[PDB]
């Protein structure tokens, strides 16, 4: 069943004090989640750089993340309901002019309808919604009507709960949640026009910067057998792969049309043939610290303006002939903590690839490679300041085949 209080703001504030007791969570719990969202420290200012951070750093933040990770541990989300938050365009990477005085451009919503619609749209950290529409305040003209699943009966219960903060009942949904555009239309709130996103969550895994260590028992959990299952040849291909052999590999794919080596040819055979026994089993997300000539840019170039860089990227599908070796742990690694771009890749589940520290040995960490001769779609460009220096988190979308 789907709930919408849509203006009503007492019927809503039953329904929040009524699931505001579902959630098992002591005053001393709720007082911790609501410094966090009363951004106390700056600890909500600074969430998206903590999470791409090197460990070490942020350690109380860190332990407070761990401590509100383990309240969403506890949601119990019974009933389905249509939440409402209004947003500034910047917030999901909407980074065109949106309005011009209380109008909406024209030109803005084709772009926006190109960027967002039928799209999945990841945020940053967790998202806070409103039971009732919210007036739409300065810039924050882009309102998001998500219909949040109870998903009860369901398979995973949805991790969303309602706590009271500022005098207000308020839902909050985990970080393992994307919002998929259903619909988009313009509205108009009191003389005001705004864009209105219709849509639904979707889950999907991320572990961020994996503070609670989950990444690679769900890793284990997922792909030992796979591990096991393997044959000497494909186990052996692969920890060849890991140890040296990925770079004579993925040179040879990526540049020297993949043909002409007998060798590699039969080693690539055997780590792909092994990459397909089992395909990526739920919605994950993935990450990956770019070097500047993999997104065509010189190593010694700073970043080109997020203007030119979405004129390059943006809504394009990027692709490689090699092996993309990615991460379920978003944490900067002294091995590349200065690159300028970060991917953060949505993986769908049936992709194919295979968790490959399941092989234990020269294997990596946390490492999920991803078949050869893959493509995603760079959904959304946004920024963030890590330790000084700014950077670029590019989402994309893999494609299945
Ligand atoms: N950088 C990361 O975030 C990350 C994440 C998980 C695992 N790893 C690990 O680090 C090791 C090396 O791999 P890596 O992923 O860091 O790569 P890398 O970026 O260091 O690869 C070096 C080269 O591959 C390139 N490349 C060339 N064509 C490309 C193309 N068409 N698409 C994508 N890249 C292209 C780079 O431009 C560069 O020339 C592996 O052993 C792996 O386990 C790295």
């Known amino acids: 069943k789907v709930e919408d209080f849509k203006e009503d703001k007492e019927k809503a504030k039953e329904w929040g004090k009524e699931k505001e007791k579902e959630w098992k969570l002591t005053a001393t719990e709720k007082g911790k989640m609501n410094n966090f969202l009363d951004n106390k420290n700056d600890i909500k200012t600074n969430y998206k750089e903590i999470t791409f951070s090197m460990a070490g750093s942020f350690e109380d933040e860190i332990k407070d993340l761990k401590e509100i990770d383990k309240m969403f541990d506890k949601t119990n989300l019974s009933n389905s309901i249509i939440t409402y938050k209004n947003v500034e365009p910047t ?17 803005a919503m084709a772009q926006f309808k190109e960027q967002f619609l039928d799209r999945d749209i990841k945020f940053d950290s967790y998202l806070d919604t409103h039971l009732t529409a919210q007036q739409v305040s300065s810039k924050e003209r882009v309102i998001l009507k998500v219909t949040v699943p109870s998903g009860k ?16 009942y308020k839902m909050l949904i985990d970080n393992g949640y994307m919002v998929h555009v259903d619909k988009v239309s313009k509205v108009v709130k009191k003389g005001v026009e705004c864009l209105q996103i219709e849509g639904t969550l979707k889950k999907s895994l991320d572990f961020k910067n994996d503070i609670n260590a989950e990444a690679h028992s769900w890793g284990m959990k997922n792909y030992e057998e796979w591990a096991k299952d393997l044959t000497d040849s494909q ?57 500047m000539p993999e997104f065509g840019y010189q190593i010694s170039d700073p970043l080109p303006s997020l203007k030119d860089f979405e004129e390059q990227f943006l809504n394009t599908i990027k692709e490689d002939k090699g092996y993309m070796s990615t991460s379920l742990s978003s944490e900067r690694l002294a091995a590349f903590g200065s690159r300028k771009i970060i991917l953060r890749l949505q993986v769908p589940k049936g ?24 493509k995603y779609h760079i959904d959304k460009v946004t920024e963030v300041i890590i330790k000084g220096v700014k950077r670029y988190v590019v989402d994309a979308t893999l494609l299945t085949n």
């Open 351 to 374: 992709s194919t690839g295979a968790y490959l520290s399941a092989i234990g040995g020269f294997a990596s960490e946390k490492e999920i490679l991803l078949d050869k001769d893959s």
């Open 91 to 107: 917030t999901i990477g909407f980074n065109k002019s949106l309005t011009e005085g209380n109008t909406i451009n024209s030109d």
């Open 153 to 168: 009966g369901s398979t995973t219960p949805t991790k969303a709960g309602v706590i009271l903060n500022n005098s207000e």
């Open 235 to 291: 186990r052996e291909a692969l920890d060849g792969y890991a140890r040296q052999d990925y770079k004579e590999i993925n040179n040879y794919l990526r540049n020297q049309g993949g043909s002409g080596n007998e060798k590699l040819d039969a080693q690539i055979k055997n780590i792909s043939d092994a990459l397909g026994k089992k395909p990526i089993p739920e919605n994950i997300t993935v990450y990956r610290w770019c070097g």
